[PDB]
Each structure stands twice: as structure tokens, then as C-alpha cells.
Design a protein around this motif. Structure first.
Motif, PDB file in Angstrom:
ATOM      1  N   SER B   2       0.758  -1.253   0.000  1.00 62.25           N
ATOM      2  CA  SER B   2       0.000   0.000   0.000  1.00 62.25           C
ATOM      3  C   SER B   2       0.814   1.345   0.000  1.00 62.25           C
ATOM      4  CB  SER B   2      -0.987  -0.005   1.168  1.00 62.25           C
ATOM      5  OG  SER B   2      -1.684   1.215   1.356  1.00 62.25           O
ATOM      6  N   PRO B   3       1.888   1.601   0.804  1.00 60.37           N
ATOM      7  CA  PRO B   3       2.509   2.945   0.781  1.00 60.37           C
ATOM      8  C   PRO B   3       3.299   3.363  -0.471  1.00 60.37           C
ATOM      9  CG  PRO B   3       3.094   1.713   2.792  1.00 60.37           C
ATOM     10  CD  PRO B   3       2.547   0.736   1.807  1.00 60.37           C
ATOM     11  N   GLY B   4       3.769   2.406  -1.273  1.00 56.71           N
ATOM     12  CA  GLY B   4       4.565   2.713  -2.461  1.00 56.71           C
ATOM     13  C   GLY B   4       3.873   2.519  -3.793  1.00 56.71           C
ATOM     14  N   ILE B   5       2.523   2.353  -3.799  1.00 57.27           N
ATOM     15  CA  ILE B   5       1.746   2.118  -5.030  1.00 57.27           C
ATOM     16  C   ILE B   5       1.221   3.416  -5.658  1.00 57.27           C
ATOM     17  CG2 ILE B   5      -0.158   0.858  -6.207  1.00 57.27           C
ATOM     18  CD1 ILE B   5       0.023  -1.252  -3.750  1.00 57.27           C
ATOM     19  N   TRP B   6       1.567   3.630  -6.927  1.00 60.06           N
ATOM     20  CA  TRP B   6       1.127   4.795  -7.686  1.00 60.06           C
ATOM     21  C   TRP B   6       0.431   4.377  -8.991  1.00 60.06           C
ATOM     22  CZ3 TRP B   6       2.088  10.023  -6.275  1.00 60.06           C
ATOM     23  CH2 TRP B   6       2.828  10.180  -5.088  1.00 60.06           C
ATOM     24  N   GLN B   7      -0.548   5.167  -9.419  1.00 58.38           N
ATOM     25  CA  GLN B   7      -1.273   4.997 -10.670  1.00 58.38           C
ATOM     26  C   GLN B   7      -0.970   6.193 -11.588  1.00 58.38           C
ATOM     27  OE1 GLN B   7      -3.849   2.515 -11.666  1.00 58.38           O
ATOM     28  NE2 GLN B   7      -3.662   3.515 -13.664  1.00 58.38           N
ATOM     29  N   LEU B   8      -0.571   5.912 -12.809  1.00 56.02           N
ATOM     30  CA  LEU B   8      -0.288   6.960 -13.771  1.00 56.02           C
ATOM     31  C   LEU B   8      -1.397   6.969 -14.775  1.00 56.02           C
ATOM     32  CD1 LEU B   8       2.522   7.018 -12.446  1.00 56.02           C
ATOM     33  CD2 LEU B   8       3.465   7.014 -14.798  1.00 56.02           C
ATOM     34  N   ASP B   9      -1.788   8.156 -15.189  1.00 60.85           N
ATOM     35  CA  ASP B   9      -2.829   8.287 -16.186  1.00 60.85           C
ATOM     36  C   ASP B   9      -2.628   9.544 -16.987  1.00 60.85           C
ATOM     37  OD1 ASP B   9      -5.351  10.213 -15.938  1.00 60.85           O
ATOM     38  OD2 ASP B   9      -5.062   9.584 -13.848  1.00 60.85           O
ATOM     39  N   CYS B  10      -3.201   9.556 -18.167  1.00 64.77           N
ATOM     40  CA  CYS B  10      -3.120  10.753 -18.960  1.00 64.77           C
ATOM     41  C   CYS B  10      -4.493  11.142 -19.459  1.00 64.77           C
ATOM     42  CB  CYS B  10      -2.078  10.655 -20.067  1.00 64.77           C
ATOM     43  SG  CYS B  10      -2.699   9.981 -21.616  1.00 64.77           S
ATOM     44  N   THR B  11      -4.688  12.445 -19.566  1.00 61.39           N
ATOM     45  CA  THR B  11      -5.957  13.009 -19.960  1.00 61.39           C
ATOM     46  C   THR B  11      -5.668  14.162 -20.898  1.00 61.39           C
ATOM     47  OG1 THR B  11      -8.176  13.567 -19.207  1.00 61.39           O
ATOM     48  CG2 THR B  11      -6.331  14.399 -17.811  1.00 61.39           C
ATOM     49  N   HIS B  12      -6.636  14.490 -21.753  1.00 62.77           N
ATOM     50  CA  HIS B  12      -6.474  15.533 -22.762  1.00 62.77           C
ATOM     51  C   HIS B  12      -7.302  16.750 -22.445  1.00 62.77           C
ATOM     52  CE1 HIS B  12      -5.136  11.845 -24.603  1.00 62.77           C
ATOM     53  NE2 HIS B  12      -4.434  12.537 -25.494  1.00 62.77           N
ATOM     54  N   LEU B  13      -6.729  17.934 -22.705  1.00 63.25           N
ATOM     55  CA  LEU B  13      -7.374  19.221 -22.493  1.00 63.25           C
ATOM     56  C   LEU B  13      -6.691  20.295 -23.339  1.00 63.25           C
ATOM     57  CD1 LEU B  13      -9.791  20.069 -20.534  1.00 63.25           C
ATOM     58  CD2 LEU B  13      -8.010  21.011 -19.073  1.00 63.25           C
ATOM     59  N   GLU B  14      -7.498  21.103 -24.081  1.00 60.50           N
ATOM     60  CA  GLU B  14      -7.050  22.219 -24.940  1.00 60.50           C
ATOM     61  C   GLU B  14      -5.946  21.819 -25.911  1.00 60.50           C
ATOM     62  OE1 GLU B  14      -7.836  25.381 -21.234  1.00 60.50           O
ATOM     63  OE2 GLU B  14      -6.016  25.616 -22.449  1.00 60.50           O
ATOM     64  N   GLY B  15      -6.088  20.644 -26.525  1.00 58.49           N
ATOM     65  CA  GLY B  15      -5.087  20.094 -27.435  1.00 58.49           C
ATOM     66  C   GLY B  15      -3.763  19.757 -26.780  1.00 58.49           C
ATOM     67  N   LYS B  16      -3.776  19.557 -25.445  1.00 50.31           N
ATOM     68  CA  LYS B  16      -2.587  19.198 -24.671  1.00 50.31           C
ATOM     69  C   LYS B  16      -2.866  17.975 -23.807  1.00 50.31           C
ATOM     70  CE  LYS B  16      -0.179  23.618 -24.735  1.00 50.31           C
ATOM     71  NZ  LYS B  16       0.192  24.829 -23.959  1.00 50.31           N
ATOM     72  N   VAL B  17      -1.806  17.379 -23.273  1.00 47.46           N
ATOM     73  CA  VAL B  17      -1.902  16.187 -22.450  1.00 47.46           C
ATOM     74  C   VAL B  17      -1.474  16.533 -21.020  1.00 47.46           C
ATOM     75  CG1 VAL B  17      -1.096  13.784 -22.167  1.00 47.46           C
ATOM     76  CG2 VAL B  17      -1.529  14.674 -24.470  1.00 47.46           C
ATOM     77  N   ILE B  18      -2.231  16.031 -20.061  1.00 48.19           N
ATOM     78  CA  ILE B  18      -1.972  16.179 -18.638  1.00 48.19           C
ATOM     79  C   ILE B  18      -1.631  14.791 -18.127  1.00 48.19           C
ATOM     80  CG2 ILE B  18      -2.832  16.895 -16.346  1.00 48.19           C
ATOM     81  CD1 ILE B  18      -4.915  18.729 -17.943  1.00 48.19           C
ATOM     82  N   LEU B  19      -0.398  14.643 -17.659  1.00 44.49           N
ATOM     83  CA  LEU B  19       0.113  13.401 -17.092  1.00 44.49           C
ATOM     84  C   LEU B  19      -0.086  13.501 -15.580  1.00 44.49           C
ATOM     85  CD1 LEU B  19       1.621  10.725 -17.426  1.00 44.49           C
ATOM     86  CD2 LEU B  19       3.746  12.002 -17.547  1.00 44.49           C
ATOM     87  N   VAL B  20      -0.857  12.569 -15.018  1.00 44.58           N
ATOM     88  CA  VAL B  20      -1.228  12.553 -13.597  1.00 44.58           C
ATOM     89  C   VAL B  20      -0.644  11.312 -12.927  1.00 44.58           C
ATOM     90  CG1 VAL B  20      -3.199  12.600 -11.959  1.00 44.58           C
ATOM     91  CG2 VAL B  20      -3.433  13.730 -14.195  1.00 44.58           C
TER      92      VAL B  20
END
Ligand SMILES: Cc1nc2c(c(-c3cc(F)c4c(c3C)CCCO4)c1[C@H](OC(C)(C)C)C(=O)O)CN(C[C@H]1C[C@H]1c1ccccc1)CC2
Ligand SMILES: Cc1nc2c(c(-c3cc(F)c4c(c3C)CCCO4)c1[C@H](OC(C)(C)C)C(=O)O)CN(C[C@H]1C[C@H]1c1ccccc1)CC2
Lengths: 142, 142
Positions: B2-20
Motif C-alpha cells: 500500500s505505501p509505495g503504489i502509484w497509478q499513472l494516467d493521462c488526460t487531454h485538455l485544450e489540445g494538450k496532455v496532462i500526465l497525472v
């Protein structure tokens, strides 16, 4: 108080600028490569840092960079207090020391800087790392 | 665990990509605006994240992006385990909701994204914020 105090500094390498934020109580660092030391670069970096860590007070090695209205807007929006005055040379020496040691492993300077940030924050000084100390300091204050 | 688990995702907005990057146990996020979803962008982001937080395991919404040898090098160097498979839609909806609410306050999309990251991590859900939960979870594991 001690858990929300950060020191910002900038250093030069390969005709580029490295903007460093140091969590004073732990020695934990965040760093990025920027084209030049500007109000806009410092403002954007501060906005990012404050969303990631509790940033209550910020100090700099360059007071003129904090006079910028863009830096003033970042501190006002994030609720950061700017404090005058300020070790820094030694952190810059240690970071450049780590950078030089890894420089050959990467093409881009920014890649070597992030490897250096990783090495510094994970380094145990039975001792604790800067990464362990910042989390310990902030959790105690919660 | 549980403490070291991360989820990466990407989403699109205004013709750009947001990496979360989402810290799964806390809901704490890091996000950046990038030109496009690439192996190089994901690799650099992972290297940065791992130097700042304990990143043991990473999941993605886009498996083909983790196949890249540049992403493989970032995970190998930082000692991150890539794990197959994976909420994400709701985080992307909440983040875009926060972004739209603040969008007019800034010229650049990246500025609005950082304001949104700040709002999300500081938001109390007597409840605790995602920022308080991540620090609490990691300090307990120390
Ligand atoms: C490009 C730009 N130019 C200016 C400003 C900001 C800027 C900087 C910030 F740190 C910030 C915000 C903005 C809008 C919104 C709230 C969160 O923080 C930006 C910003 O881009 C950056 C620099 C890359 C982050 C953007 O995308 O708009 C901020 N301006 C301040 C004078 C209005 C006066 C002011 C207002 C409040 C406090 C202090 C001064 C000067 C010009
Ligand atoms: C530009 C570039 N191209 C490649 C690679 C890396 C790269 C990416 C990393 F994530 C990284 C490192 C490097 C050198 C060094 C150790 C820390 O992590 C970079 C890097 O720039 C980025 C993408 C902007 C970060 C840079 O500046 O050099 C990595 N290469 C892997 C195949 C060698 C094989 C490999 C090696 C180890 C494990 C898996 C595959 C492909 C091309």
C-alpha cells in the motif's frame, strides 16, 4: 515554524540554471533545470512545490528574484510568507558533486539532475535519509 | 504493499496532455502538462516522482506507454516494479472540474493545472486532506 520552511537557490551548470528548493529542517530537495533565473520560472516552481508539500515560509539566496510581481502572485495565491535573508554553497557543491558522478549516464542535464535529486533524498546519513526526515517532521506536526 | 503504489494516467485538455500520478492509498496527486503522451515524457516524470516520494510499484491506464525502453530504463534505475492492470475517470473528471473553475485566473494551462493540484491535495474530506494522508501513510511505514 520548522516544518514549513524552505530555501530556494539557483546554481549554474553547462550554460543552464538549476533551481533548487531545500526543506531546511530535513535537507530534502526538489530541483529543476530552467533556461534562466526569472520571476516567471520561480513563480511556477513555487506554485508546484506548494501543491506538493506544506510550504509556509520561503527564503532565497537572491532577494531581487522575489521582488517580481509574478513571484508575489505565486506566494499570495499559495499563502506562502516571503522571509528576508537565509550551507547553500555546500548543498550546491554536494549536488554538483552527485551530478558530475552520474553525468555520463545520461544525454540531458535535466536527467542527471533528477538522478542527483533521487540519490540525495534516498541517501542514509541506522541513519535516516532526507526523504524519511521530511515525512517524519511533517507527520509529527499533523 | 500500500505505501509505495502509484497509478499513472493521462488526460487531454485544450489540445494538450496532462500526465497525472495518483498515490493510490491517499488520493494525493502530482500532475504536469506535456506536449504528447510519449515514452520519454513518462520516463522523465517517473524519474522525478521516484526521487521525491517512495515509488515501489507503478500502474498505468496505457500499457503500451510502459513497453517503451526509455520507461523501462526509468523503472530499472529507480527500482520501480511495473505492474499490469489498474476511479481514474472520476479523478480525471474531478481534476478537470477543478481546472475549469480556475482556468480564467491564469493565462497558461500548466498554471491552472498546478492550482488544481494544490486545491486537490489540500482539500479536507475534522477530515484529512490527501496531503496529510500520504505523509501519515509513509511515516507509519518508517
Ligand atoms: C504568465 C503569467 N504572468 C503573470 C502572472 C502569472 C501568475 C503567476 C502565478 F504564480 C499565479 C497566477 C498567475 C496568473 C494565478 C494564481 C496562481 O499563481 C502568470 C502565470 O504564468 C506563470 C508565471 C508561468 C505561472 C499564468 O499562466 O498566468 C501574475 N501577474 C501578477 C500581477 C497581477 C499582480 C499581482 C496579483 C496578485 C498578487 C501579486 C501581484 C503578473 C503576470
Ligand atoms: C534521451 C534518453 N534516451 C534514452 C534513454 C534515456 C534515459 C531514460 C531514463 F529514464 C534514465 C536514463 C536514461 C539515459 C539514465 C538512468 C536514469 O533513467 C534518455 C534520457 O532522457 C529522458 C528520456 C528525457 C529522461 C537521457 O537524458 O539520456 C534510455 N534508453 C534505454 C535503453 C538502453 C536500454 C535500457 C537500459 C536500461 C534499462 C532498460 C533499457 C533509451 C534512449
Amino acid at each position: 515554524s520548522s516544518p514549513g520552511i524552505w530555501q530556494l537557490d539557483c546554481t549554474h551548470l553547462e550554460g543552464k540554471v538549476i533551481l533548487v528548493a531545500v526543506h531546511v529542517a530535513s535537507g530534502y530537495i526538489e530541483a529543476e533545470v530552467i533556461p534562466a533565473e526569472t520571476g516567471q520560472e520561480t513563480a511556477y516552481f513555487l506554485l508546484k512545490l506548494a501543491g506538493r508539500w506544506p510550504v509556509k515560509t520561503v527564503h532565497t539566496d537572491n532577494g531581487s528574484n522575489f521582488t517580481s510581481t509574478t513571484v508575489k502572485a505565486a506566494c499570495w495565491w499559495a499563502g506562502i510568507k516571503q522571509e528576508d535573508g537565509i550551507v547553500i554553497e555546500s548543498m550546491n557543491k554536494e549536488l554538483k558533486k552527485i551530478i558530475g558522478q552520474v553525468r555520463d549516464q545520461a544525454e540531458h542535464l535535466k536527467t542527471a539532475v533528477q538522478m542527483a535529486v533521487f540519490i540525495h533524498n534516498h541517501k542514509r546519513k541506522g541513519g535516516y535519509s532526507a526523504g524519511e526526515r521530511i515525512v517524519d517532521i511533517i507527520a509529527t506536526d499533523i
